[PDB]
């Protein structure tokens, strides 16, 4: 597909809830018309956006001309959070180039809803446990209770259990691999005998 004029973003797959970061919104032109844009994005409660180059309005970008701006943004919620950024051409402001007709389709404006990841603020860290309960003809039970809310932030507390027998993760290779001829001295001979 294509678009002679749109806006592209530049932002990671993920951020952290804690620290701030610029979101850089780049706008590109290829059709011969050279037109200013009102590129922007609604500030929605799952974050905080702040531009740096609004008051100086853009001038124009022409065919194979592109501009870019910033938003010193920081998230507030956690998870995938849409970034709906909207931009459109303009008319009768012929200050940058010769003319600015600016009559594209009903879809003349590229409004782009995009969900990016965040992790909760701060140095994360883990915690681990385990067990075994093998009644070979009867019953067993057990409990495990789990609390570390000293000096944390909410609900990044999360965990996940496991259920299995753990015996075959290496069973194939070493077994079939390791059968060999006897040769060598008594030392080598035992070395290759005994494993078998």
């Amino acid at each position: 597909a294509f678009q002679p004029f749109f806006v592209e973003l530049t932002m990671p797959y993920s951020v952290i809830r804690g620290e701030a970061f610029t979101l850089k919104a780049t706008v590109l032109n290829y059709l011969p018309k050279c037109i200013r844009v009102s590129v922007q994005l609604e500030a929605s409660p799952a974050f905080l956006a702040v531009p740096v180059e609004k008051e100086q309005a853009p001038h124009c970008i022409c065919a194979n001309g592109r501009q870019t701006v910033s938003w010193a943004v920081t998230p507030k919620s956690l998870g995938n959070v849409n970034f709906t950024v909207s931009a459109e051409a303009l008319e009768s402001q012929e200050l940058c180039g010769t003319e600015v007709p600016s009559v594209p389709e009903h879809g003349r404006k590229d409004t782009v809803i995009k969900p990016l990841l965040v992790e909760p603020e701060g140095l994360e860290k883990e915690t681990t446990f385990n067990s075994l309960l093998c009644p070979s003809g009867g019953e067993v039970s057990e409990e495990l209770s789990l609390k570390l809310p000293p000096n944390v932030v909410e609900e990044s507390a999360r965990a996940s259990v496991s259920v299995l027998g753990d015996i075959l993760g290496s069973a194939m290779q070493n077994t079939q691999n390791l059968l060999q001829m006897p040769y060598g001295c008594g030392e080598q001979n035992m070395v290759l005998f005994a494993p078998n």
């Binding site: 909760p120 701060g122 140095l123 000096n151 932030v153 990044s156 996940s160």
Partner: peptide, 17 residues
């Protein structure tokens, strides 16, 4: 499990200014 820590440990000793 996992979780997040270090919201503390910003104290004010003398520290020679």
């Amino acid at each position: 499990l996992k979780y997040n820590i270090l919201p503390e440990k910003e104290e004010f000793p003398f520290a020679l200014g």
